[PDB]
Amino acid sequence: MYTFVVRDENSSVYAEVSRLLLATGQWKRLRKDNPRFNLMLGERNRLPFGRLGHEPGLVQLVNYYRGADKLCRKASLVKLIKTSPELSESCTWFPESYVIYPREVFLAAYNRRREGREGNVWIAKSGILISSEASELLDFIDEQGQVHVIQKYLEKPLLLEPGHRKFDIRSWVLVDHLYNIYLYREGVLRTSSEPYNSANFQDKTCHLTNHCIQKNYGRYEEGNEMFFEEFNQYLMDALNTTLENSILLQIKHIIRSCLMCIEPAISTKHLHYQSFQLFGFDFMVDEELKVWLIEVNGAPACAQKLYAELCQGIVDVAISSVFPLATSIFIKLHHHHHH
Amino acid sequence: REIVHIQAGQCGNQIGAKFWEVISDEHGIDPTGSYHGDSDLQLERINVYYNEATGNKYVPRAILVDLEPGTMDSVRSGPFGQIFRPDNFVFGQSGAGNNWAKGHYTEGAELVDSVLDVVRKESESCDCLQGFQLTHSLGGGTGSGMGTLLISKIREEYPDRIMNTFSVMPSPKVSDTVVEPYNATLSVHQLVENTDETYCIDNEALYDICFRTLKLTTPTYGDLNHLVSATMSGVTTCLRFPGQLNADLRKLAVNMVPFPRLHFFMPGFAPLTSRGSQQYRALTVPELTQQMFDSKNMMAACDPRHGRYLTVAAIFRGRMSMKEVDEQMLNVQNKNSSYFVEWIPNNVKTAVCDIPPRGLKMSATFIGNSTAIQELFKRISEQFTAMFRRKAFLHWYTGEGMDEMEFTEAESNMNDLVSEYQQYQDA
Amino acid sequence: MEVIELNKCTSGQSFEVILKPPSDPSLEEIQKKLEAAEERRKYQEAELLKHLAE
Amino acid sequence: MRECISIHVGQAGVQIGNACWELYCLEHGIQPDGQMPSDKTIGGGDDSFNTFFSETGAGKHVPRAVFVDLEPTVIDEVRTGTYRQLFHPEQLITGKEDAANNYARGHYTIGKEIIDLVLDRIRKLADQCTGLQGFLVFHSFGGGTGSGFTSLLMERLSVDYGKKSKLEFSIYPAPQVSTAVVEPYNSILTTHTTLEHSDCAFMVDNEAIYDICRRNLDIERPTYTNLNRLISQIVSSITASLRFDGALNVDLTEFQTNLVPYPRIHFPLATYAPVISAEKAYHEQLSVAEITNACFEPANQMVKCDPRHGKYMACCLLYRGDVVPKDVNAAIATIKTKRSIQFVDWCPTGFKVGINYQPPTVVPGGDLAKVQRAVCMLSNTTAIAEAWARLDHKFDLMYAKRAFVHWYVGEGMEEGEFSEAREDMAALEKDYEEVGVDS
Numbered sequence A: 001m002y003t004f005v006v007r008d009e010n011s012s013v014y015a016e017v018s019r020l021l022l023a024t025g026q027w028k029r030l031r032k033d034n035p036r037f038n039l040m041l042g043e044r045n046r047l048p049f050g051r052l053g054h055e056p057g058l059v060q061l062v063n064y065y066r067g068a069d070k071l072c073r074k075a076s077l078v079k080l081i082k083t084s085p086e087l088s089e090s091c092t093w094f095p096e097s098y099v100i101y102p103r104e105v106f107l108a109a110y111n112r113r114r115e116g117r118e119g120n121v122w123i124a125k126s127g128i129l130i131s132s133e134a135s136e137l138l139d140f141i142d143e144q145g146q147v148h149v150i151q152k153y154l155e156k157p158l159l160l161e162p163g164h165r166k167f168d169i170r171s172w173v174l175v176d177h178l179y180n181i182y183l184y185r186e187g188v189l190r191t192s193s194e195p196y197n198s199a200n201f202q203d204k205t206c207h208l209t210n211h212c213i214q215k216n217y218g219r220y221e222e223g224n225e226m227f228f229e230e231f232n233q234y235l236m237d238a239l240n241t242t243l244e245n246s247i248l249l250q251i252k253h254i255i256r257s258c259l260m261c262i263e264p265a266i267s268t269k270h271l272h273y274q275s276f277q278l279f280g281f282d283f284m285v286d287e288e289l290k291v292w293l294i295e296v297n298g299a300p301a302c303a304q305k306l307y308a309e310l311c312q313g314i315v316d317v318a319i320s321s322v323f324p325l326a327t328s329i330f331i332k333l334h335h336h337h338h339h
Numbered sequence B: 001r002e003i004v005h006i007q008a009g010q011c012g013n014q015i016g017a018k019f020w021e022v023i024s025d026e027h028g029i030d031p032t033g034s035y036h037g038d039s040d041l042q043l044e045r046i047n048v049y050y051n052e053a054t055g056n057k058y059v060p061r062a063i064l065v066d067l068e069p070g071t072m073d074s075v076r077s078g079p080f081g082q083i084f085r086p087d088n089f090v091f092g093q094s095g096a097g098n099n100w101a102k103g104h105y106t107e108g109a110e111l112v113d114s115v116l117d118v119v120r121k122e123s124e125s126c127d128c129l130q131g132f133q134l135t136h137s138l139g140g141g142t143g144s145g146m147g148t149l150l151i152s153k154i155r156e157e158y159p160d161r162i163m164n165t166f167s168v169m170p171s172p173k174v175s176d177t178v179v180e181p182y183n184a185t186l187s188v189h190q191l192v193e194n195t196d197e198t199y200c201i202d203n204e205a206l207y208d209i210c211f212r213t214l215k216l217t218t219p220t221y222g223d224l225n226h227l228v229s230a231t232m233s234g235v236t237t238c239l240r241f242p243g244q245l246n247a248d249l250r251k252l253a254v255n256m257v258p259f260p261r262l263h264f265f266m267p268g269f270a271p272l273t274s275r276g277s278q279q280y281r282a283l284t285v286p287e288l289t290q291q292m293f294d295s296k297n298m299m300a301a302c303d304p305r306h307g308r309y310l311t312v313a314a315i316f317r318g319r320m321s322m323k324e325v326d327e328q329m330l331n332v333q334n335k336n337s338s339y340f341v342e343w344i345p346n347n348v349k350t351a352v353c354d355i356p357p358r359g360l361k362m363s364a365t366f367i368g369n370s371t372a373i374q375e376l377f378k379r380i381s382e383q384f385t386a387m388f389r390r391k392a393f394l395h396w397y398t399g400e401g402m403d404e405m406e407f408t409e410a411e412s413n414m415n416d417l418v419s420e421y422q423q424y425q426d427a
Numbered sequence C: 001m002e003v004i005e006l007n008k009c010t011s012g013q014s015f016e017v018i019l020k021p022p023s024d025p026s027l028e029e030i031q032k033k034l035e036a037a038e039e040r041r042k043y044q045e046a047e048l049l050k051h052l053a054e
Numbered sequence D: 001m002r003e004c005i006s007i008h009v010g011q012a013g014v015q016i017g018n019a020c021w022e023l024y025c026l027e028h029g030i031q032p033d034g035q036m037p038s039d040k041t042i043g044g045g046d047d048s049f050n051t052f053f054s055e056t057g058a059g060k061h062v063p064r065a066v067f068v069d070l071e072p073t074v075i076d077e078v079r080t081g082t083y084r085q086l087f088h089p090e091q092l093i094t095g096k097e098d099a100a101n102n103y104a105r106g107h108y109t110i111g112k113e114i115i116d117l118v119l120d121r122i123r124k125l126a127d128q129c130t131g132l133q134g135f136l137v138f139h140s141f142g143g144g145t146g147s148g149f150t151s152l153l154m155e156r157l158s159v160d161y162g163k164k165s166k167l168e169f170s171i172y173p174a175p176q177v178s179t180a181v182v183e184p185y186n187s188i189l190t191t192h193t194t195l196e197h198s199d200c201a202f203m204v205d206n207e208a209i210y211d212i213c214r215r216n217l218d219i220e221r222p223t224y225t226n227l228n229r230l231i232s233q234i235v236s237s238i239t240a241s242l243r244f245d246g247a248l249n250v251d252l253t254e255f256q257t258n259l260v261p262y263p264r265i266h267f268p269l270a271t272y273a274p275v276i277s278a279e280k281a282y283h284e285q286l287s288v289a290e291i292t293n294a295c296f297e298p299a300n301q302m303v304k305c306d307p308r309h310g311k312y313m314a315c316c317l318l319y320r321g322d323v324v325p326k327d328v329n330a331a332i333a334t335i336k337t338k339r340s341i342q343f344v345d346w347c348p349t350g351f352k353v354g355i356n357y358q359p360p361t362v363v364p365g366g367d368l369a370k371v372q373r374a375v376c377m378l379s380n381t382t383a384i385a386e387a388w389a390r391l392d393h394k395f396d397l398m399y400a401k402r403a404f405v406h407w408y409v410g411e412g413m414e415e416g417e418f419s420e421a422r423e424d425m426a427a428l429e430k431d432y433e434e435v436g437v438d439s
């Protein structure tokens, strides 16, 4: 009989994990401030990591990796990628980005771009702004009042037909207490329902692919959610390639690169408590079938049809591996090249 | 750190004499008072309960009190009656007639100063007196009425010493008189104000254990007192034997009593054994741990699952693995965490004593400060109100000078104590 | 990796290696606090004796 | 040569003092009767070991130490133990009834009855000093004496010895070995009153020592003897620079200079390696690189916490045994590339290293094996504040319902002191986050 507490009532994924654990007949939910738990489904902010691992007689596990936030925040990600030699400023799969607070390095980037006779249109961070002249860009940063990064807006995205539409790929990644990196079988493609209009960036619906900002909506697929089998079938018919060869190979390389970089900082291998965490990686693919990393979310929400399967995978892979009870949906990412 | 023991009334002297019988055997003292044990570990803390007499003999620091002479003569007639000091026998000739007013206000008042002179005599010969323990019942007149008057007067002379009681609660299943709810309610009001720790020994629970568990169809008082004796020996094990803990009465009270009025403990013992019945199979540490927490092993007729544990003290006796004890004790708290208040972290303390009690290789004693003890006080209050609403049997008490308003106040204070337990059960 | 201030003796050595550069109450008050707590004790004790007197 | 006086308060401070002074005698060659055959200057001297030992005309070396307990059972074992003749009877001070795990009883009720005597005995040791530098105070957080009396003593020492440094060795409460449910109360109360009066405090979490004894010494249920002998090794590592020849941490003032850049953040984290069992048959002696890398494993720390999620303000490496600077620097270079070591921006990223060539000494019959090299790291990291968060949270749970508070008010303490102490701890936590956490 294992015990757990719930401290993020707004988590749809771990609400489903709570139901799955109780339905096993071998897990019991305690009051939220009961310290005698085996598992903590913790809050999103100021989680008391310092209080874990000090209960004699209890192996304790938590659904969050302390320090993983420096991957899951816009400004911190650019800092991590540019300063970590494992990734470097020469990193090929991250768009050119610059941290600016309300830089002479970013100003010298557009100064070489637009005055160099090339494309130049970027994006904001944290409502966003897509502009070609930096004057509008920086002016909005000071009006907003938060740290922002200026990132190259992929002017040449891969456009799904029929529709000339834009789109982003969401990958769910589970990292267990042993720091196994598990890529969930099922991704999802959040889609834009409007024709990508390079002429007018004020049209927010054909440039931003957030499921919320798409609120026109649902013409081509339900909920603007295209999944891997159909998208694989599309690239086969349209582009004579597969999802695995043209996209997923890069995605698996980016996921492993990011998490292997921060592993020494966040691993709980020899810690008095243990950590797992579910991540949400968001990718962009251009028309050259090159995959770009846009951001990664530390508390993602699943797709409706995939909730039952992914949350069941979290239990088997992350929770029952530590707390055992009385073909796999994940792809374990590992690579050992000798050089 | 010496303790002064006092037994008052029939029940107090009967369980008191049998307590001295049990621990004298544990420490190797014969009825004459000579030491004939095999280990010097029995004498390391012998001074807590015994004085050293001429001839290197050990005399209990015990005072025997009653308003009736007969029961104290039976004590002197008892197997270990000659061990006690003759000047510590303080008795009247009236008898209290199961009347709290007679014990507290009239007959007992005549004798109480004589008892305090023996208490003073015994305390003056103490290097560092820690406090007093009283054995008595609450249903009669002497141990109830005169015992609580004795407690009040002792607190007046020794206000910084610990006051400890083993108080036997009345039950209709083992009932001598209809006025026992009156005597108990008036006594509980006193104990709430003037004791630091009270072990609630419920005659209802003692009977139920003898009948349902020990398979005794007709339990004598001797059967009931066999459970009381084993329990009293258990809860005093730390005081009487050297161990890793150097515990005393005040440190126990500080750790067990989060609020001054909530100092009534549920005692528990495992394994439950019948008198004379031999135990061939020793319990394991998991068995001891689950029995000592079982409701069937509680000496107070309360359901622990109906309340929450504020604090718990557990005492293991015998040769066993401290690792296994720690694991089993942690297992009980971790698997039953809902029944321990979360606002008192780490509220369970465990001690292990290498010397087991007589006739057992392994044993465990439970001491719980649980809010479920309100069930015991609710039951006494209900039996009190059933008669007080018609002022039934009150003339026995108004003939000794008491007024009905004193009954109302005692009833009110105990209902207040019940509501105070309820407040922390929901907190 | 600059090794600074290397001092050596027959008992051992000590040094500094730098990787990167940067970027009361008086006696009377105590006696007053202790005496104020004893006064609260003797008041609380006097209330008990007054209560016992009643 | 500047003398140091050791003060041991309560059971924990006394018993740890016993094991420390036993280790000191073995390290310096002083026998239980106090003689030191290697000391050729009979009756006096200004050697490094004279910082902790005075000398009689009979050549007997006497610890500059006072033992205080409000109850006599513990110190009586010192009066009758192996080192009975080592201490003058005036160095051992006992009452008759203790503080009963009550800070208020140790600080106010009982402490006021004995302090003037304790200060008088301390003055006797101070008067035999030609240049006293300060005090080393050993005590527990959880005990009534270790918390209540120590804070009272620290206040008076500031008055009587205004310019003297005061260092603490503090035992942080752990349920695995604790004696009282109110130890979170006593810990916050004593830290609040002592904070301004301590220049440097080395916290030892009994939980960390307990687990190290279980994991690395293969002891199923560690006793106080197992814990205190391991604590003494760490304490000896920290004080060795005061008792032996060297250039680093030669006086108590240097501990504050090297480890404590800000006054209130004066709790350095100690990490020790290697801890190897005597019962281990085949052993592979660990190199300079392996013991230095072990300093950054939380399992070897005196307080369980994660320095990767805090910031460093100072780092000292105290080696004993076969260690040369070349290997230290090579080990540091390798470690810096693989470990998460971030200093604050107003501190240089550097390690202060001290090396004593004599390997650590072990008590005959002890649990620790002899090793050719050992190291104790003293780092001032904000990660130690995790221990404050754990303690303050347990404080909050009990105090919200005023559980056990009547025991303290009954001894003359006021309820306002609880909130005063807790509100100071809240400020201390804010200081640690401020310094160590980036936005």
Ligand SMILES: Nc1nc2c(ncn2[C@@H]2O[C@H](COP(=O)(O)OP(=O)(O)OP(=O)(O)O)[C@@H](O)[C@H]2O)c(=O)[nH]1
Binding pocket: D009, D010, D011, D012, D013, D015, D016, D069, D070, D071, D098, D099, D100, D101, D102, D106, D140, D141, D142, D143, D144, D145, D146, D147, D171, D172, D173, D174, D177, D178, D179, D180, D183, D206, D209, D224, D225, D227, D228, D231
């Ligand atoms: N590491 C270690 N901790 C100890 C030792 N003795 C006691 N403690 C710890 O110290 C804390 C408080 O207990 P004590 O120091 O014994 O109590 P005290 O200072 O004597 O104060 P009072 O007895 O209440 O007057 C507890 O957490 C104990 O676990 C010891 O020998 N070694």
Ligand SMILES: Nc1ncnc2c1ncn2[C@@H]1O[C@H](COP(=O)(O)OP(=O)(O)CP(=O)(O)O)[C@@H](O)[C@H]1O
Binding pocket: A095, A123, A151, A152, A153, A154, A155, A166, A167, A168, A207, A208, A209, A210, A280, A282, A284, A294, A295, A296, A297
């Ligand atoms: N360099 C870039 N180039 C082109 N489009 C970009 C872009 N960066 C962001 N976008 C667009 O913004 C949309 C949302 O991305 P972003 O990560 O900034 O918002 P978000 O934080 O709400 C994602 P989630 O919360 O689901 O993890 C993407 O779908 C993409 O179309």
Ligand SMILES: COc1cc(-c2nccc3[nH]c(-c4ccc5cc[nH]c5c4)nc23)cc(OC)c1OC
Binding pocket: B235, B236, B237, B238, B239, B245, B246, B247, B248, B249, B251, B252, B255, B256, B311, B312, B313, B314, B315, B346, B347, B348, B349, B350, B351, B367, D179, D180, D181
């Ligand atoms: C275990 O049983 C006894 C112990 C003691 C005892 N002695 C000294 C310090 C003691 N702290 C404690 C103690 C008690 C409860 C809790 C809960 C959390 N932490 C605690 C510590 N109990 C102490 C005394 C006894 O009799 C007088 C005993 O028998 C009845």
Ligand SMILES: Nc1nc2c(ncn2[C@@H]2O[C@H](COP(=O)(O)OP(=O)(O)O)[C@@H](O)[C@H]2O)c(=O)[nH]1
Binding pocket: B008, B009, B010, B011, B012, B014, B015, B096, B097, B098, B137, B138, B139, B140, B141, B142, B143, B144, B168, B169, B170, B171, B174, B175, B176, B180, B203, B206, B221, B222, B224, B225, B228
């Ligand atoms: N357990 C137990 N209870 C007793 C014993 N003798 C009396 N009682 C109980 O005590 C109450 C009567 O009190 P008693 O001691 O006889 O009155 P007193 O002598 O005037 O104080 C009744 O509730 C009895 O059930 C005994 O030997 N053992």
Ligand SMILES: [Ca+2]
Binding pocket: D039, D040, D041, D042, D043, D044, D045, D046, D055
């Ligand atoms: Ca000399």
Ligand SMILES: [Mg+2]
Binding pocket: A295, A297
């Ligand atoms: Mg986001």
Ligand SMILES: [Mg+2]
Binding pocket: B010, B140, B176
């Ligand atoms: Mg009778």
Ligand SMILES: [Mg+2]
Binding pocket: D010, D011, D071, D098, D143, D145
């Ligand atoms: Mg003590």
